[PDB]
Design a protein around this ligand. Sequence first.
Ligand SMILES: [K+]
Ligand SMILES: [K+]
Ligand SMILES: [K+]
Ligand SMILES: [K+]
Lengths: 82, 82, 82, 82
Amino acid sequence: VPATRILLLVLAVIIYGTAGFHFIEGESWTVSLYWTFVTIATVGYGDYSPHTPLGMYFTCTLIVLGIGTFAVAVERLLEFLI
Amino acid sequence: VPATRILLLVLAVIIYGTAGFHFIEGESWTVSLYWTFVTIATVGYGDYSPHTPLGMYFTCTLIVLGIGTFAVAVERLLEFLI
Amino acid sequence: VPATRILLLVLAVIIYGTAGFHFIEGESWTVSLYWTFVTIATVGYGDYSPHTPLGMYFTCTLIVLGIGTFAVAVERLLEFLI
Amino acid sequence: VPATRILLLVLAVIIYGTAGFHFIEGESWTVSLYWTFVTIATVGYGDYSPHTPLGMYFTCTLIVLGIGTFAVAVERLLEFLI
Ligand SMILES: [K+]
Ligand SMILES: [K+]
Ligand SMILES: [K+]
Ligand SMILES: [K+]
């Protein structure tokens, strides 16, 4: 699958996660972007997490749509620097 | 392995994790479902976690039965949206 | 690699992690076993973590020796139930 | 890819992560090395995490550059002890 397509897909995931957390959980755009990366990479520090039922549902959706996409993106990126 | 079979398997994991956490740790059904996804995806925020020995044992079982199943499910889902 | 050999390897990792955490960080055997699974599975709730320099070094060693071993063990287990 | 090259790459990631956390977030060299492993392995206990915008940005960079590199390094190490 073309590396550039995978890039657009992960970017779309990042936008989805970031806007969602910002609007549902009320954290700043910067914190929301950070939380999105920490979540889809499966790091999960837990310094930020959803505190509402809608936020919990949303986070589950992001986990399902985002973890795989991020994993493929990382691996494709490996190919280019390595 | 047929994607729909993997779907049923991950659904069964999700039911197992959610009912187990709800009954053993006493959190709500919604929190327990959320915790199940957060656990089997290996995110592990830690906003929720078991506080009893039985809950700890149970969580180890869920980790072993669930992490692989979820990974395969994510990868199969990748195939279909992509 | 024979599935049973992988089983022995992950059991050895679990023993190493559990005894190490118990003796270095002073948590109970049960908590230490749970923490070991939570760590080598990469869940990392953070309800338990090392608070000493030796514990931090030890945890890095467990991460390096344990995460791959657990990953291979999970995948092999998948094959037998699936 | 030669295992020793992968070794150098992960060592470089570890240096990057450790110095970055130490200087941006102000934690000790030891805590910063520990946090780097905990992050690039995707464990993410959350006992340590960035509390500044620059730290958050930096952590996202380390996640992208480090998680893949660490995964390949673990897998190569598997080959040699096994
Ligand atoms: K993880
Ligand atoms: K994690
Ligand atoms: K975590
Ligand atoms: K955590």
